[PDB]
Structure 1
Amino acid sequence: VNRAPVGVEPQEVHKWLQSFNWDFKENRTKYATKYHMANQTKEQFKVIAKEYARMEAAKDERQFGTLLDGLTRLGAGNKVHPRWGETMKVISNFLEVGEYNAIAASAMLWDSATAAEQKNGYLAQVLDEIRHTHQCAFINHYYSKHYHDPAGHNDARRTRAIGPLWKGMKRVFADGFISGDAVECSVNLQLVGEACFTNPLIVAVTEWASANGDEITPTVFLSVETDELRHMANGYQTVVSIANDPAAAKYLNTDLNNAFWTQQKYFTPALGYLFEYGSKFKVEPWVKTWNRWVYEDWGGIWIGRLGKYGVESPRSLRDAKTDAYWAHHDLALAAYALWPLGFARLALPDEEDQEWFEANYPGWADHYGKIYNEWKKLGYEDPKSGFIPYAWLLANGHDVYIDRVSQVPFIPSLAKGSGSLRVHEFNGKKHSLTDDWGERMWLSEPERYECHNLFEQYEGRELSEVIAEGHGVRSDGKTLIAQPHVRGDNLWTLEDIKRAGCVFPNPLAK
């Protein structure tokens, strides 16, 4: 009998994991689906629960120790630009729910997975994205504990519903991944994000946070990217598995185009606003980095890796870039108009910001810079002015309509990007469509989208009353969560909103 010290390795356990399954008739995917992946499917990463736990625990402590010692010793929580403080506030608030619906959709995948190895990969995905949720929540917690504006992080979950961008983020990550069919959910929840959005989004957030001067986010986001690489590998493997299916060649390209368009339509303007208009120190124009990350280093490699299996690149990218060239600015105008609804505090671009925008974006001045200038000179920041940008927009004939499919705020008269307003009548209810693809999607599947526009939600409701009943007031009970100015002086009060007297008119009802 041998007595040499022998240490077992996870390789054999993973090898037997494939044979762990046993076959019988009644076993089936619980959820509706039209695709069935191959019963056998290899995974790039040989991962067991124990090895995964060790790998995650090492980096998790590492990052918690870093944040709990170095960041609090340097006092870097307070040494951040408040604009970027609000920007990271909204970023963390949105990404936490994004990753939560990510674990939900990955659980759907694991339910609709036949291969045991693929099931283990999906379980690792679920646990990794649970980690991501908790890390985002912990970033919010540390910002609340140390950063000088706690209010936005304290009531992040409760006051999230009031904002208009929240519906769009819900549609892209929350309901964008769980509502589809299981295969489709995979690409939207995984490939569409991991490749075209999450991979780049992270590096950009780290770089911009380093530029502005907050070291709390980078560490967490890099730790997230570590698992996101495994997510990419799992995506590629599961797309390989879903190939060779006769139905795959009939619907996979359509699902890919659907997911890509649905994700980009709101993703592009959202980041564009949160980066260009949410920071004082900008490293590089957002149009160039968006184009690069979404197309040059995504389409080439992924079509190289997938077209061998019969995958066609979406042709919506030619319209997507034309939209993206001004969609972030359009959403910027919409958000600056609807600031009282949102939780984050915002600052109008300054003269250096205006000249930066004009130098990087030709024609930005004559379209947006004056609009911001007359907004500033009409007592935008001043609480005693009692000026509401939405009231000015209504008085000027420019009225905002959100899409029914993507729920993105959209101004038809004040947008230079492509896309047009479409109003539809169906069984006594009017519907607003902003894009041809969205119009087609709503037309084919009216039962798919029933999201209630906030305009009829707040119809007959005064804005200050909506804020008060939505817990949009500060802890003191006299001031709003959001402010027109990044400065910590002359904070707006709910009585100022009452004096303004903005009333929602149902713009779509017209």
Structure 2
Amino acid sequence: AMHPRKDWYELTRATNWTPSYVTEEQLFPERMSGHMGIPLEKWESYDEPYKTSYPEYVSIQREKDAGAYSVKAALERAKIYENSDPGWISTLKSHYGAIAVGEYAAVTGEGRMARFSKAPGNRNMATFGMMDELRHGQLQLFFPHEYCKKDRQFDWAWRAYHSNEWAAIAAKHFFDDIITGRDAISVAIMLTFSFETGFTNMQFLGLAADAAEAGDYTFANLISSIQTDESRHAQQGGPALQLLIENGKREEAQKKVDMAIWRAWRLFAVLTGPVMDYYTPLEDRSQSFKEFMYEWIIGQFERSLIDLGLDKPWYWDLFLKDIDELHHSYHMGVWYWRTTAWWNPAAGVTPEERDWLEEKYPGWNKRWGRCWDVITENVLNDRMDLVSPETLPSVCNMSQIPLVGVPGDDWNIEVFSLEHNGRLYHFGSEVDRWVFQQDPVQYQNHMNIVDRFLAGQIQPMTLEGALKYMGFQSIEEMGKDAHDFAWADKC
């Protein structure tokens, strides 16, 4: 006979002890552990709600992978690359580039907890977490690898995080802030709770819905399998938060959640927003970006956050306004400066699409539509020089994404600036400035790409110079309109 896990599980996490040969603080240094002075004994209350054990883990993960790879193998000849809308192909390129090596970085966040968390259950669940993120990094390198021979842009599944391309810098600045750059408890709160229970569902399940509509089952099956692991290891954050609250650290906990959610939001707005509302073919848009946000972030995540005893973020109303507006401007920017992306942005403004956008975002045509009108006119008149930039966008010193606002009939744009230690910083929102002010030592000497350009670090100081600095190794790699402006034939 075998004894049920419930009977022996406690012994697997009975691993705290009282140090005698070094001090508790030497063993768990605050800068790495983030225990906020809460003594070892209090951490033994930590109780992970989504448990597993080693023999169950290897058996189940074996099954998960067999499925993912079997489906990929069975569909190699489904002509996805050849027959898919180019906007869908760009969605794949964007995803793998933005995600693959970041998953591998998350191994480090999990490792930080496995070594430095004072909670024994956390250290064990973080060990499975290390393994999960290893899986995710390896899957998301293996899957796009077969397309290298088709398209140099797929090289960026591996190359992106090794580059200074603007979006890769935005990704690294975020992940290095919430995953690899902070103590174990900060990781538990910012990565496992805020990012992994909050936002990743948008990219790994929301996008899976669009993938299924688009007929890309290899991809939909892959990312939904990945999320099954996320759903387990993300459950490390809640018990940490509850423990902090019980131990008089609610204010500190709340601030970390608020910071992480906002930082994640700005990144998802530039990555997932354009994909869901513009790149994905209209027929395959299961819901709009905003609709998915209301499902996943408001309906599910925010409700869970309240249930655990935290408060809605201070910036709630600003966040709601942003969901209506931000990604439309981010999309416009990514497309106008497409040559700096490693994917081919689709404009997504054919009349049929503009009607959809108007339905999903009343007033769209009188705002972003005004700029797209000018662009469309230029395209129809073959004035192609007017659809490519001759200067740099101004960039947020927090998110590393350009500073945008609402264009058109009710134009409104605001930059939030800050003098600090003899330097002038610029932020794309009140919250981004607030994030900086929460922890200036984390950020103060970081230089964004525009800062570097102005300081003489990018030579020559030209578009070509910047493109080389960003790591583009050939002309084919630079982004172009997904459809080579064929969409104009609809206008």
Range into which the TM-score falls when normalised by the shorter chain = 0.7 to 0.9
CA deviation map 1:394-438 (0-9, x unaligned): 6xxxx8422112222123473879872133444553321222222
CA deviation map 1:70-96 (0-9, x unaligned): 111434443322111111211121122
Alpha-carbon spacing, 1:426–1:222, altered in 2? closer, same or farther (3 Å): closer
Q: What is the alpha-carbon distance in structure 2 between the residues aligned to residue 479 and residue 20 of structure 1?
A: 54
Aligned to 2:298: 295
Q: Conserved in 2, the CA contact under 8 Å of 1:323 and 1:418?
A: no
Aligned to 2:354: 354
**1:441 aligned to 415, 435, 443, which one?**
435
Residue correspondence of structure 1 range 398-409 to structure 2 within 5 A: 400-409=393-402
Aligned to 2:75: 71
Aligned to 1:457: 452
Q: Which runs of 5+ in 1 are unaligned?
A: 1-5, 490-510
- Percent of aligned positions with the same letter in both sequences? 18
Q: Conserved in 2, the CA contact under 8 Å of 1:330 and 1:411?
A: yes
CA deviation map 1:139-165 (0-9, x unaligned): 2213435xx5x2111244435635323
SS of 2:426's partner is strand
SS of 1:430's partner is strand
Aligned to 1:89: 93
Q: What is the alpha-carbon distance in structure 1 between the residues aligned to residue 192 and residue 3 of structure 2?
A: 33
Aligned to 1:432: 426
Q: What is the one-letter code of the residue matched to 2:54?
A: A
**1:60 aligned to 38, 62, 65, which one?**
65
Alpha-carbon spacing, 1:35–1:109, altered in 2? closer, same or farther (3 Å): farther
Residue correspondence of structure 1 range 41-60 to structure 2 within 5 A: 41-60=46-65
Question: Per-residue deviation at 1:251?
Answer: 1.4
Q: What is the one-letter code of the residue matched to 2:316?
A: L
Q: What is the alpha-carbon distance in structure 2 between the residues aligned to residue 446 and residue 381 of structure 1?
A: 49
Q: Of the two, which has the highest radius of gyration?
A: 1
Question: Per-residue deviation at 1:209?
Answer: 0.7
Aligned to 2:194: 192
Q: Conserved in 2, the CA contact under 8 Å of 1:194 and 1:228?
A: yes
Residue correspondence of structure 1 range 84-483 to structure 2 within 5 A: 84-144=88-148, 148=150, 150-158=151-159, 161-246=163-248, 248-281=249-282, 282-304=285-307, 306-307=308-309, 311-349=310-348, 350-379=350-379, 385-387=384-386, 389-391=388-390, 400-412=393-405, 414=407, 420-426=414-420, 429-443=423-437, 445-449=439-443, 450-459=445-454, 460-468=460-468, 470-474=470-474, 479-483=476-480
TM-score in terms of structure 2 length: 0.85
Q: What is the one-letter code of the residue matched to 2:334?
A: A
CA deviation map 1:234-290 (0-9, x unaligned): 3333334444213x1341122222222222233234311121121113222221221
RMSD (CA atoms)? 2.9
Q: What is the one-letter code of the residue matched to 1:402?
A: V
SS of 1:378's partner is helix
TM-score in terms of structure 1 length: 0.82
Q: What is the alpha-carbon distance in structure 2 between the residues aligned to residue 363 and residue 324 of structure 1?
A: 14
Q: Conserved in 2, the CA contact under 8 Å of 1:159 and 1:472?
A: no
SS of 1:118's partner is helix
Q: Conserved in 2, the CA contact under 8 Å of 1:176 and 1:185?
A: yes
Question: Per-residue deviation at 1:299?
Answer: 2.0
Question: Per-residue deviation at 1:322?
Answer: 0.7
Question: Per-residue deviation at 1:344?
Answer: 0.7
Q: Conserved in 1, the CA contact under 8 Å of 2:378 and 2:387?
A: no
Alpha-carbon spacing, 1:321–1:52, altered in 2? closer, same or farther (3 Å): same
Alpha-carbon spacing, 1:7–1:266, altered in 2? closer, same or farther (3 Å): closer
Q: Which runs of 5+ in 2 are unaligned?
A: 455-459, 487-491
Question: Per-residue deviation at 1:62?
Answer: 2.1
Q: Conserved in 2, the CA contact under 8 Å of 1:103 and 1:127?
A: yes
SS of 1:423's partner is strand
SS of 2:424's partner is strand
Alpha-carbon spacing, 1:453–1:359, altered in 2? closer, same or farther (3 Å): same
Q: What is the alpha-carbon distance in structure 2 between the residues aligned to residue 360 and residue 413 of structure 1?
A: 16
**Greater mean alpha carbon deviation, residues 411-420 or residues 222-231:** 411-420
CA deviation map 1:86-128 (0-9, x unaligned): 1121112112233223221121122222343321111011111
SS of 1:108's partner is helix
SS of 2:279's partner is coil
Q: What is the one-letter code of the residue matched to 1:263?
A: A
Q: What is the alpha-carbon distance in structure 2 between the residues aligned to residue 243 and residue 272 of structure 1?
A: 34
Question: Per-residue deviation at 1:201?
Answer: 3.2
Judging by fraction of residues, say which structure has more helix.
Answer: 2
Alpha-carbon spacing, 1:79–1:465, altered in 2? closer, same or farther (3 Å): same
Q: What is the one-letter code of the residue matched to 2:302?
A: G
Q: What is the one-letter code of the residue matched to 1:442?
A: F
1:23 aligns with 2:18: yes
Alpha-carbon spacing, 1:385–1:202, altered in 2? closer, same or farther (3 Å): closer
Q: Conserved in 1, the CA contact under 8 Å of 2:315 and 2:431?
A: no
**Greater mean alpha carbon deviation, residues 415-424 or residues 153-162:** 415-424
SS of 1:431's partner is strand
Q: Conserved in 2, the CA contact under 8 Å of 1:190 and 1:235?
A: yes
Aligned to 2:457: none
Alpha-carbon spacing, 1:423–1:313, altered in 2? closer, same or farther (3 Å): closer
